[PDB]
Structures are given as structure tokens and as C-alpha cells.
Amino acid sequence: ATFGAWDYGVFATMLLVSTGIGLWVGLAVPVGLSLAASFMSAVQVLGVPAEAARYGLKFLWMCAGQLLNSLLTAFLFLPIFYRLGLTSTYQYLELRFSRAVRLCGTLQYLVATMLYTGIVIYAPALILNQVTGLDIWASLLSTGIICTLYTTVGGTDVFQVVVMLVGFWVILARGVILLGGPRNVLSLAQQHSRINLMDFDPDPRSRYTFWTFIVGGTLVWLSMYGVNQAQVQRYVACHTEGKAKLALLVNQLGLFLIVASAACCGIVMFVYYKDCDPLLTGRISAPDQYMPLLVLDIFEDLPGVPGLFLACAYSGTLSTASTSINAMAAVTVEDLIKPRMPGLAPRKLVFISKGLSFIYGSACLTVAALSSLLGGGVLQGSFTVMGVISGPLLGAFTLGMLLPACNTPGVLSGLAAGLAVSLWVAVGATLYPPGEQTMGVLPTSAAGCGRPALADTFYAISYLYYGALGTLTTMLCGALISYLTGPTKRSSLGPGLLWWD
């Protein structure tokens, strides 16, 4: 399970070329594909195939969970932000409830993005460690060095999406060629119940079901695209509000393609490891090393393909991390400092921007190391952190956008309660992980070569519900206390803020 001779050279050369091009640069369909490219880091490459291989093909419902998300963002959140010409999405909060809510929302965005970028830095480290033969910590150090060179020197997404999706297609083609024909692969996956699209298991403990996707995944993708900062800023830069919607729908098509290719590569990966499954044989340690192992195993006759594909999947996600870190620094120095501080020359402010970029780089690397220590689940971990933090923020946004009677006390108390409950599940589900069989992990073979009351019912809910469980309560708490301290008469909101218009 190591690169080899022709693969190390290709990996090194491609990484050097990627860094050189990125720095040399530093010193409406394109945007649609850039939006998806953002969240197509190594996290998805390592998670979606593994989840599809383990839990079956129900993971395709994720696409639906994104589709229903985009529609909402297309027809419920895009008009409000776009028609108001908001410089920052969280400026809405300031115009709606108060500047304190703007501050809290910006802080939640910063923390959530920091954790998510830490996990996005962890995943490439996982790739490098699993494929080269370096301990997780030396690989994490190398990943941090490269990410900081990208960020603290100088900040194409269409190219990344195209190249990595073509890599997915090539992996799938080679795999299905090896296993015979596509009909044989489909029948083999069908024998072991890997083709189970129709899974309406009502219970919420099941990790992946129709309800779980349509609700939790929809709300999480909403709090990752609908009310995010970078995505909304990309929207508002377009024209006439039609180009924005077309960019959003093209982004949705790109996401559909990426996640469907990944969910099919997962099934190919399983059918490949039908017997002598690497996981319960000691060949790999966690169910996130599946994809690099598949890449190495299938292309054990092509001297170069592993290096090219993994170098791309590494450099593109490091670029994503640098972009997220720089956006974090920019929003901090635009929405929190400059409004607060009277006014400072263009030198001190760029120096503060560099300082915040560096600080966020270090904090994200530290979060990556913490994720490495705790365990795995780059996909699960990223969704967990993002949902857990940004869910109540999305609840605040939705309460402001669709409920007239809502004031600052309501939103703030709702955020407090939502973060409380969301972290309750986020931790109580980490101290007492749910059983592998309650999560519905499909069977496998390897012969071819509840202590507390709530750990069994409430901490076991699907990891896609956490954010939802936050958002909903934020709406229900904020709706309640707001109506207690006093309703907010609708004749106080001026321009279009409520969507009831």
C-alpha cells in the first residue's frame, strides 16, 4: 500500500507544478463550476466512495438533498440577498435584528469555517500518509507547510472539477473493466444488497435513509451554500439576478455529477473487495483509506495514474483550504475590525489581514491534528462540525427571512439553545458512538485471499440530523422567546427582508 517508483515522481512533479502555477498567479458557467469545486476537496473523494461501498447506493439520495437545497437557495434566499445588494450576507442580520446578531453570526461563520477547513486539511494529510508511508504527523506537517506557502505567499476551479471528475470516471471505467462487464458488477452489487435506493427506514438512528438525506442533508447543504458567506458573495457579483440563478443551477448539475460519480465508484470499489475486504483484514485501519487503496490496487499496472490522480486530489483541496482561510481573514478584517476601528491606512490593514490569514492557517492545522487524533470520518466529521455550528445560524437566517414577529432577543436565545442542543448531540454521539448495526452498515466478508440512557436512542441519531436538530430548535426557541418578550410589528422592516413580499 505504497506509491512506488513511477508514482512518487509523478506526484512530486504535479504538486510542484500546481504550487508554481498557483503562486505565479498570485504574484457564467465557470462560476457555477467553481461553487461546486469549492466543496469537492479530498474530503468527498475519500468519504463518498467509502460510504457508498459500506452503506450501499442510498448515498445517491445526497444528490437529491442538494437539489432540494439549491431550489431553496434559488427561490428563497437568493432574491433576498441579491435584491438588497448586501455587501456581506450577514449584513442581513444587522439590517434585520441588530448589529449584535451580525457579530454572533460572523463569529459562528468563522468558527464553523475554521473547523471545516481543519478537516479539509486533515483529509489530504490522510491521503499522503496512507499512500506514501509517512506517519500521520509528518504528513500533517508537510500539508501545513504547503498550505501556509499557498496562503502566506499568494492565493481554475473549473479545471479542478473537470480533472477530478474525469479521474472518477477513469477509476470507474478501469474497475468495471476488471470486474468483467457493467451487468456483472450490477448483479454482484445487487446480490449483497448494495443497490437499495428505496430505503425509507423511518427510524432516525439509521445513518443513511430517504428521510435522513431529504431533511438533514438538505439543511446542511443550505447552511453550506444558502447562507454561507463566500457562496453568497459569488452570487451577488453577477447581473440581473438571472445569471445568478443560472450559475446556481449549473453548480447543482456539477454537484450531481461529482457525487453520482463518487457513489458509483464506491459500488465498484465494494464489488472489487467483495471477498477479502481490506477493512476487517488489517490491510487498512479506518473506512476512509478505502479510496486510495482502491486507486493503488486497480492501477498497479499503470506506473503513473495513482500519482497524477492523488496529486490533483491533494493540490486542489489545498487550494480550497487556502481560499477558505483567506476568505476568513478578509471577512474578519471587513465585517468586524474596520466597522469597529475608526479607520486605518492601507498598510496596517493589509498587515492585519496577513496576520489573520496566518492565525487561521495555524488554527485550522491544529483542528486537523485534533481530527487526526480523535479518529476518522473526513466526510462525517466535516458534515458534523459544519452542521453543528452553522445549523443554528441558518435557523436565525430563516427566522428573519420568513417570520415577521422576531426580535434580537429571540434570535440570540434561539442561537444559544440551538448550539446547546446541537453540541449536546455532537458530543454525546462522540463519547458513545452508535452501534455499527443500528447505523445499517451492510454486511461484508474477509475470506478471499449504551451505558447512559440516551446513548441508545438520542445520541444514535444520524450524523446528518445534528445540524438539522440545531436549526429546527433555533427556529422553535427563537419563535417562542421572541413572542414572549414582545412581538416585532411588521411595520418596522422597511425594504424587502421578510420573504412574504
- Judged by the rule CB under 5 A, the positions of this chain that interact with Na ion are 39, 41, 43, 382
- Determine if residue 41 is labeled as part of a ligand binding site: yes
User: Closest CB to ligand 3PH among 322 and 488?
Assistant: 322
- Determine if residue 439 is labeled as part of a ligand binding site: no
List the single partner that 406 binds among ligand 3PH, Na ion, none, CB under 5 to 8 Å by kind.
none
DSSP 3-state of 332: helix
List the single partner that 350 binds among ligand 3PH, Na ion, none, CB under 5 to 8 Å by kind.
none
- Determine if residue 480 is labeled as part of a ligand binding site: no
Cell numbers describing residue 295:
486507486
Q: In the complex, what is the shortest distance from the CB of residue 406 to Na ion, in angstroms, rounded to a whole number? A: 29
Q: In the complex, what is the shortest distance from the CB of residue 109 to ligand 3PH, in angstroms, rounded to a whole number? A: 12
Q: Per-residue b/e over 158-172, b at no fewer than 16 CB within 10 Å?
A: bebbeebbebbebbb
* C-alpha torsion angle, residues 474, 388, 62, 252 (rounded to 10): 80
Enumerate binding residues for ligand 3PH (CB under 6 A).
111, 115, 118-119, 363, 366-367, 370-371, 374-375, 377, 380-381, 384-385, 388-389, 426-427, 430
**CA dihedral for 331, 332, 333, 335, sign (positive or negative):** positive
Nearest to 371 by CA among 107, 54, 125, 51: 125
Separation in Å, CA 280 to CA 49, 213, 337, 446 = 17, 28, 52, 7
User: Closest CB to Na ion among 39 and 272?
Assistant: 39
List the single partner that 475 binds among ligand 3PH, Na ion, none, CB under 5 to 8 Å by kind.
none
Nearest to 216 by CA among 336, 72, 342, 69: 69
- Runs of H (alpha helix) within 152-241: 157-178, 182-191, 210-212, 218-221, 230-236
- Please provide residue 180's backbone torsions phi and psi, each rounded to the nearest 5 degrees: 105, -105
The amino acid occupying position 18 is: S
CA distance 100 to 121: 31
- Please provide residue 176's backbone torsions phi and psi, each rounded to the nearest 5 degrees: -65, -30
- Determine if residue 382 is labeled as part of a ligand binding site: yes
List the single partner that 39 binds among ligand 3PH, Na ion, none, CB under 5 to 8 Å by kind.
Na ion
Q: In the complex, what is the shortest distance from the CB of residue 120 to ligand 3PH, in angstroms, rounded to a whole number? A: 11
User: Closest CB to ligand 3PH among 12 and 427?
Assistant: 427
Nearest residue to ligand 3PH, scored by beta-carbon proximity = 381
**CA dihedral for 101, 104, 110, 112, sign (positive or negative):** negative
Residue that the C-alpha cell 467553481 belongs to = 34
Nearest to 151 by CA among 290, 354, 311: 354
Q: In the complex, what is the shortest distance from the CB of residue 48 to Na ion, in angstroms, rounded to a whole number? A: 9
Q: Per-residue b/e over 183-196, b at no fewer than 16 CB within 10 Å?
A: eebeebbeeeebbe
Q: In the complex, what is the shortest distance from the CB of residue 290 to Na ion, in angstroms, rounded to a whole number? A: 17
- Determine if residue 268 is labeled as part of a ligand binding site: no
User: Closest CB to Na ion among 185 and 262?
Assistant: 262
- Determine if residue 379 is labeled as part of a ligand binding site: yes
Q: In the complex, what is the shortest distance from the CB of residue 362 to ligand 3PH, in angstroms, rounded to a whole number? A: 7
Q: In the complex, what is the shortest distance from the CB of residue 385 to ligand 3PH, in angstroms, rounded to a whole number? A: 4
User: Closest CB to Na ion among 160 and 413?
Assistant: 160
Q: Are 316 and 41 in contact (CB under 8 A)?
A: yes
Q: In the complex, what is the shortest distance from the CB of residue 48 to ligand 3PH, in angstroms, rounded to a whole number? A: 15
List the single partner that 361 binds among Na ion, ligand 3PH, none, CB under 5 to 8 Å by kind.
none
Cell numbers describing residue 118:
481543519
Nearest residue to Na ion, scored by beta-carbon proximity = 43
List the single partner that 41 binds among ligand 3PH, Na ion, none, CB under 5 to 8 Å by kind.
Na ion
Q: In the complex, what is the shortest distance from the CB of residue 224 to Na ion, in angstroms, rounded to a whole number? A: 7
Cα atoms in the 13 Å half-sphere on the side-chain side of 255: 26
Query: CA angle, corner 243, sides to 238 and 244, nearest 5?
Result: 65
Cell numbers describing residue 292:
486510495
- Determine if residue 424 is labeled as part of a ligand binding site: no
Residue that the C-alpha cell 434580537 belongs to = 408
List the single partner that 32 binds among Na ion, ligand 3PH, none, CB under 5 to 8 Å by kind.
none
User: Closest CB to ligand 3PH among 412 and 464?
Assistant: 464
Q: In the complex, what is the shortest distance from the CB of residue 340 to ligand 3PH, in angstroms, rounded to a whole number? A: 18
User: Closest CB to Na ion among 57 and 255?
Assistant: 255
- Determine if residue 386 is labeled as part of a ligand binding site: no
User: Closest CB to Na ion among 119 and 294?
Assistant: 119
**Cβ neighbour number for residue 271 with a 10 Å cutoff:** 24
List the single partner that 111 binds among Na ion, ligand 3PH, none, CB under 5 to 8 Å by kind.
ligand 3PH
- Determine if residue 72 is labeled as part of a ligand binding site: no
List the single partner that 43 binds among Na ion, ligand 3PH, none, CB under 5 to 8 Å by kind.
Na ion
User: Closest CB to ligand 3PH among 80 and 426?
Assistant: 426
CA distance 166 to 60: 19
User: Closest CB to ligand 3PH among 114 and 312?
Assistant: 114
List the single partner that 410 binds among ligand 3PH, Na ion, none, CB under 5 to 8 Å by kind.
none
End-to-end CA distance of the chain: 59
CA distance 391 to 324: 19
Question: Is residue 1 classed exposed, middle or buried when 0-12, 13-18 and 19+ CB atoms within 10 A define those classes?
Answer: middle
Binding residue numbers: 41, 43-44, 48, 62, 116, 221, 224, 379, 382-383
Binding residue numbers for Na(+): 41, 43-44, 116, 224, 382-383
Binding residue numbers for iodide: 48, 62, 221, 379, 383
